[PDB]
Design a protein around this ligand. Structure first.
Ligand SMILES: Cc1ncc(COP(=O)(O)O)c(C/N=C(\CCC(=O)O)C(=O)O)c1O
Ligand SMILES: Cc1ncc(COP(=O)(O)O)c(C/N=C(\CCC(=O)O)C(=O)O)c1O
Lengths: 276, 275
């Protein structure tokens, strides 16, 4: 199906939807969003995503322009119209003004609906490279629209798949992904005091609980990578994507590892539990 | 009325729209400049447009128009406004990042608004800043990312502006160059750390003319109790006195004599840089 945008009460073809230049998302980068994906055309972790969207807006002093029930109504209606596997992005804008009450009270919203684009199967076979940077995401619980560092930082990337935020040599997360390290057959991942509360992350920790795999919620260190067996990044579109290189450092023997492939299989076998 | 130049026309500002496909909207990929007028002439027009090109190039965005063309639009829009104007040319990422790692379908538009100077009372009383432990990444680049300038005013205590103070080193304001005055000297962060402000560049020339010493280092939050004065600079706000940073009063909590002197010399001198 054609890509859609829900804006001003209607589903438009995506390429026709426009936003007023007065909006502070355009002028000043004031915006939050979510990415929601489907399996068998059903939305995965819809409620957790919409609660995260509200968290992002409230933490950003943005007054929600619609109820979560209303956003869920729109998202379901658009997925039905797409009739295929879909990546859905609801956006909440700052709107035209920051009031004397220090809130954005005229927020706009729109929802993008696109045919899903999974990473190429070769990337799951070979794994990917990450480019570490000495930077952090501010207000890391908040998912804002600001991804400019993910792009401008590709000059020095050496064709890395994704940037990895490594402030002072402590690995937190990717620009689009949760990061997991594997040492001694268990999982190391940054705490959500420092990293986004990923929906895929939440599911992987539940799968680890079910499988009696130990999870340490601490920032893995760049200096620990020589001793690691495996690594992977997570997100709703990419699922579990093996990581075989970070900077100049090969992870383990430089191919996807057995615990990564195991968790990926259990994820896909289990996924129906979290569809809405 | 306020205007936006977009797709070859001056529109009423409130009617101009941008495709939601644009990565400025989806991913915050955008750069811009703020240019202000005195006597209907843009101040430091060429320095601003050189900064805009620098921002775009540093961000892998291919210029969608020449600087001469942007200068032409800006002058025509100032003439159409018929008042003192704040002008903001924007350059967007456009719809795609190519295999060549460039934004090659950049869009652009130019906002013209009647200027809004800080109220005269703010120059008389000075303003408060809210310090935060954060930095602007790629600080020479002026991107559209000002989200922290707002969201970081949660516990602001009614501060005028946030001040980037990473690890207690003062760099700059969210919209401003920061200057500390100590022993009759100016202290301001080097351009390795802070935006190369146009107002900043003029104030350093005014310091040279007045034999006022400038130290290009980050003032520390711990130095503030020994400071005499502070001010912030930008093309709209000129020199705006700072009398409080966080809980710390600056000097005796009113605008200082060197700030008021430099502001007077600035107003007398800026004709030199009107274009
Ligand atoms: C900063 C950050 N960390 C982690 C994640 C992963 O969270 P979740 O597992 O809930 O998707 C995302 C989502 N990144 C996406 C899309 C998801 C994907 O990467 O597949 C984004 O919306 O940009 C993210 O933007
Ligand atoms: C991060 C930052 N630093 C410094 C400056 C001061 O530069 P200049 O002296 O060239 O104006 C600005 C301008 N910020 C503005 C306008 C503020 C003003 O005009 O007073 C802005 O649009 O955000 C800025 O955004």
């Amino acid at each position: 199906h054609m890509n859609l945008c829900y804006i001003d009460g209607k589903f438009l073809p995506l390429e026709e939807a426009k936003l007023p230049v007065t909006d502070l998302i355009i002028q000043r980068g004031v915006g939050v969003f979510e990415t929601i994906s489907t399996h068998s055309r059903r939305p995965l972790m819809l409620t957790p995503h919409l609660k995260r969207l509200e968290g992002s807006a409230t933490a950003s002093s943005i007054v929600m322009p619609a109820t979560l029930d209303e956003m869920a109504r729109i998202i379901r209606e658009g997925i039905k119209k797409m009739g295929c596997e879909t990546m859905v992005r609801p956006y909440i804008t700052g709107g035209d003004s920051f009031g004397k009450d220090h809130l954005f009270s005229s927020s706009r919203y729109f929802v993008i609906f696109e045919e899903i684009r999974k990473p190429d199967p070769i990337l799951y076979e070979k794994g990917v490279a990450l480019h570490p940077i000495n930077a952090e995401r501010y207000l890391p619980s908040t998912k804002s629209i600001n991804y400019m560092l993910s792009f401008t930082g590709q000059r020095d990337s050496k064709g890395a798949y994704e940037i990895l935020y490594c402030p002072e040599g402590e690995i937190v997360e990717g620009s689009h992904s949760t990061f997991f390290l594997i040492k001694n057959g268990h999982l190391i991942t940054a705490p959500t005091s420092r990293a986004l509360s990923g929906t895929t992350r939440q599911i992987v920790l539940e799968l680890a609980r079910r499988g009696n795999i130990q999870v340490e919620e601490r920032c893995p260190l760049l200096t620990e990578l020589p001793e690691a067996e495996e690594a992977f990044i997570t997100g709703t579109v990419k699922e579990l994507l093996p990581v075989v290189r970070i900077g100049d450092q090969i992870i383990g023997n430089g191919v996807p590892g057995k615990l990564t492939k195991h968790l990926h299989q259990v994820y896909l076998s289990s996924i129906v539990e979290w569809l809405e």
